[PDB]
Amino acid sequence: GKDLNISLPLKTKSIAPYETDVPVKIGAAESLFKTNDQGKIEKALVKSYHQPNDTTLDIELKDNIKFQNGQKLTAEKVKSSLENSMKKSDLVKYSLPISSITAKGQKLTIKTNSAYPELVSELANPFMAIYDTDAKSDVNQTPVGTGPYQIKDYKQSRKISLSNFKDYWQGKPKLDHITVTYQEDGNNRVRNLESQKDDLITDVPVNKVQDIENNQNLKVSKESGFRTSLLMYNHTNKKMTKSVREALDHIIDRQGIADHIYQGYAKPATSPFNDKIPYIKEPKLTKQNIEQAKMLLAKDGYTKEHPLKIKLITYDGRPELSKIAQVLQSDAKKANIEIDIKSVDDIEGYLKDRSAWDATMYSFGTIPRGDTGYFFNQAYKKDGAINKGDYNNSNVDDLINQLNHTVDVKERHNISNDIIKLSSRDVPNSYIAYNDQIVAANSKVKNYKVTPEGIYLIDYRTTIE
Ligand SMILES: N[C@@H](Cc1c[nH]c[nH+]1)C(=O)O
Numbered sequence: 001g002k003d004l005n006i007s008l009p010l011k012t013k014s015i016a017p018y019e020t021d022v023p024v025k026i027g028a029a030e031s032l033f034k035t036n037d038q039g040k041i042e043k044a045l046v047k048s049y050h051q052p053n054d055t056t057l058d059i060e061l062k063d064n065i066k067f068q069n070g071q072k073l074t075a076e077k078v079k080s081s082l083e084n085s086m087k088k089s090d091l092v093k094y095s096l097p098i099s100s101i102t103a104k105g106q107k108l109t110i111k112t113n114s115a116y117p118e119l120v121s122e123l124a125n126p127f128m129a130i131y132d133t134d135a136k137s138d139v140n141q142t143p144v145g146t147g148p149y150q151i152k153d154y155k156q157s158r159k160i161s162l163s164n165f166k167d168y169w170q171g172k173p174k175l176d177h178i179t180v181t182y183q184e185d186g187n188n189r190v191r192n193l194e195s196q197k198d199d200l201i202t203d204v205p206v207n208k209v210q211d212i213e214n215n216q217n218l219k220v221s222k223e224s225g226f227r228t229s230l231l232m233y234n235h236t237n238k239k240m241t242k243s244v245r246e247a248l249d250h251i252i253d254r255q256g257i258a259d260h261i262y263q264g265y266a267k268p269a270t271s272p273f274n275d276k277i278p279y280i281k282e283p284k285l286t287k288q289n290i291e292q293a294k295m296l297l298a299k300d301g302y303t304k305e306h307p308l309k310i311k312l313i314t315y316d317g318r319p320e321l322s323k324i325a326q327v328l329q330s331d332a333k334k335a336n337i338e339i340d341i342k343s344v345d346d347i348e349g350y351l352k353d354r355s356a357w358d359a360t361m362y363s364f365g366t367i368p369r370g371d372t373g374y375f376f377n378q379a380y381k382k383d384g385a386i387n388k389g390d391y392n393n394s395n396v397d398d399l400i401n402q403l404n405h406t407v408d409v410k411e412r413h414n415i416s417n418d419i420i421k422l423s424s425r426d427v428p429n430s431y432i433a434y435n436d437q438i439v440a441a442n443s444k445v446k447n448y449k450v451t452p453e454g455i456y457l458i459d460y461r462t463t464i465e
């Protein structure tokens with residue numbers, strides 16, 4: 001009827017908002033701030049804010065917003081939600097250096113110990129979405145948000161069932177029910193859409209695009225966005241030296257990968273950040289050079305007789321990652337590297353054991369809210385939530401820490417470019433492609449989001465006609 005079936009990759013365990021962005025994606029939860037369709041920060045739950053000095057953020061919340069259980073969204077609810085999220089998540093904690101929060105009625109005041117210009121921006125992060133900390137349910141299964149669709153049932157790592165929240169603050173949502181099921185294999189997601197098992201899918205394999213476009217019952221939406229695919233190195237394994245990382249960097253054929261594996265739905269990458277961000281000074285594009293790789297590996301003593309052995313992790317959710325792994329393995333052989341590919345079902349959980357991998361295929365939204373700070377803090381600082389390989393260089397640390405308290409935007413751009421230049425010398429990861437997000441749907445599904453931040457999907461206007 002007016003029910004929507006969504007098929008997503010990257011199955012979750014907990015679906016607390018501070019564990020995954022899935023509750024924001026599927027319309028269950030909202031952050032205080034958001035980005036609009038052009039990527040700019042906007043008030044969402046907030047009516048007004050002021051910044052009277054560089055350590056003070058005064059917020060007045062909208063007065064007409066309820067949680068899905070009917071409880072009013074107040075300043076005290078926001079305070080308790082934020083403090084809980086900071087307590088329970090390293091990602092949230094390291095993004096929000098908040099020193100104190102006071103609340104009364106609809107007003108709260110957030111303090112920092114020193115200037116942190118990206119505070120408002122990080123309050124738009126979906127991991128900072130607001131939920132009712134007093135709800136009598138398990139926030140890991142059925143968090144209570146302000147979104148248009150309330151989570152009613154969660155089968156862990158398999159299925160999320162949501163129902164229309166009729167009192168949703170922006171307007172009456174247009175669907176009755178949503179069912180979200182996880183499917184890691186992109187080809188399976190496409191088959192589910194074709195057989196009408198599901199109505200809306202993300203992360204369409206590039207080689208199925210034409211097939212879907214040919215179908216008059218279906219439609220494809222594509223967006224260049226700001227997701228980067230990469231080869232992430234485990235810096236805690238002493239064999240993963242600078243020479244080894246340089247060598248693997250030169251076994252990659254970025255141009256070939258973009259043309260043939262992404263079939264043109266991507267561009268060759270250099271830094272973490274899409275070059276369509278105008279202030280970014282990218283490092284020089286690395287072109288494939290097997291001889292150079294062989295030479296570099298000679299430095300550490302590797303030969304055809306005694307090759308480097310690499311355990312490379314991959315996963316299906318982003319469909320092109322394992323295709324890249326396959327051709328890396330084939331090409332690396334020519335350079336005296338024997339790569340073992342291990343595909344895993346739960347990539348975030350698997351990488352926690354740093355004894356179990358040498359490198360991994362990976363994909364991340366490296367600049368979701370227009371600033372490079374978030375990526376640096378989460379990926380290049382020790383204990384950052386996506387620094388799976390524990391890269392850390394005190395000289396890069398120093399610049400990141402300076403960036404974090406830098407207010408002048410031109411100076412933020414300069415420091416960010418210095419961070420990019422300096423860190424690139426270490427090859428902390430090998431950035432492979434800036435690739436498009438491709439979504440597909442039954443043609444009767446209307447008004448889902450496919451916008452450049454690559455987070456949002458369902459809102460109160462999404463519908464079926
Ligand atoms: N960050 C990786 C792995 C992941 C699993 N779940 C969320 N993320 C990706 O999005 O592809």
Ligand SMILES: N[C@@H](Cc1c[nH]c[nH+]1)C(=O)O
Binds near residue numbers: 021363365366385386
């Ligand atoms: N899946 C999102 C968010 C995330 C946090 N940690 C891992 N992933 C991304 O890759 O951008």
Ligand code: NI
Binds near residue numbers: 363364
């Ligand atoms: Ni991710």
